[PDB]
Write a protein that binds this ligand. Structure first.
Ligand SMILES: CCCS(=O)(=O)N[C@H]1C[C@@H](N(C)c2ncnc3[nH]ccc23)C1
Length: 289
């Protein structure tokens, strides 16, 4: 149980259109010896966003896996109008920041160890028919030098039993440069669209988060200056339809780029499964040694 009066703000960790994550101390003894936790809260709270947040909390509470961030509890203290999700806090931070910082000691075998773990986490979500929808290094956390965890479930949805996709028509900001074509055009999300986004995560890893090499940076460079009265998402859809793809990262092995290109198939049914991805990654890693 978490009492609101004992949560002490330390630092901001990240932001989403309607959500924010903060590093807080939970200090019931009020002597600064309390545990440091990660607190997720709604930015501009609504009755609709609260119900969605309740679902997100039920999703994370239902997950227990070595490569999934741990649920600690909730903090209401003021009915259902100031709901907070309490999670474990990982001092090493996001994989996005860690990779950039430690790019000299992180080798390809290490990148593939993280890749394998994300795949394992994703296969586990699949057993529960959960679609993550927002896979990105920004949302992956570093437990230690040999372990990562999927750390946010803000866009995660459960598939209904009757279909293999979830349709989401909703404002505002979508991570369009991580989205599968059918997610851009039909707002259709599936295990297959999470595989496409995984391909983009694999790309982020092998660029070591070089700012000018990010998926928005590369797609924008490919779209070019000829924007002339058309939106960026219109240009992106056309580019993907015409088989335009993110380039092979500098020093990335052909076999690893092949996995990315397979994830980025226009036909959802031709994309690999997360079990096949783990097999292929684990073996490329074993061969590197
Ligand atoms: C709201 C949209 C998602 S976001 O803000 O783009 N990414 C999240 C911030 C968080 N993160 C870096 C964390 N850092 C350390 N410990 C942690 N536990 C739990 C989380 C967490 C992932």
């Amino acid at each position: 149980q978490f009492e609101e009066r004992h949560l002490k703000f330390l630092q901001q960790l990240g932001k989403g259109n309607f959500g924010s994550v903060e590093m807080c101390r939970y200090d019931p003894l009020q002597d600064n010896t309390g545990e440091v936790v990660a607190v997720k809260k709604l930015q501009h709270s609504t009755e609709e966003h609260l119900r969605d947040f309740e679902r997100e909390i039920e999703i994370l509470k239902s997950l227990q896996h070595d490569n999934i961030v741990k649920y600690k509890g909730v903090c209401y203290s003021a009915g259902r109008r100031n709901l907070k999700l309490i999670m474990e806090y990982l001092p090493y931070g996001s994989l996005r920041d860690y990779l950039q910082k430690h790019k000299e000691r992180i080798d390809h075998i290490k990148l593939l160890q993280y890749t394998s773990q994300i795949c394992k986490g994703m296969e586990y979500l699949g057993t529960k028919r959960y679609i993550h929808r927002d896979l990105a290094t920004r949302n992956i956390l570093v437990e230690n030098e040999n372990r990562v965890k999927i750390g946010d479930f803000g866009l995660t949805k459960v598939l209904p039993q009757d279909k293999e996709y979830y349709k989401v028509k909703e404002p505002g900001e979508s991570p369009i440069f991580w989205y599968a074509p059918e997610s851009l055009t039909e707002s259709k999300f599936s295990v297959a669209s999470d595989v496409w986004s995984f391909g983009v995560v694999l790309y982020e890893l092998f660029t070591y988060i070089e700012k000018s090499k990010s998926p928005p940076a590369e797609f924008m460079r490919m779209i070019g200056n000829d924007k002339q009265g058309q939106s960026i998402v219109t240009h992106l859809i056309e580019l993907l339809k015409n088989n335009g793809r993110l380039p092979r990262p500098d020093g990335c092995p052909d076999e690893i780029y092949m996995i990315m290109t397979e994830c980025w198939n226009n036909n959802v049914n031709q994309r690999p499964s997360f079990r096949d991805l783990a097999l292929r990654v684990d073996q490329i890693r074993d061969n590197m040694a």
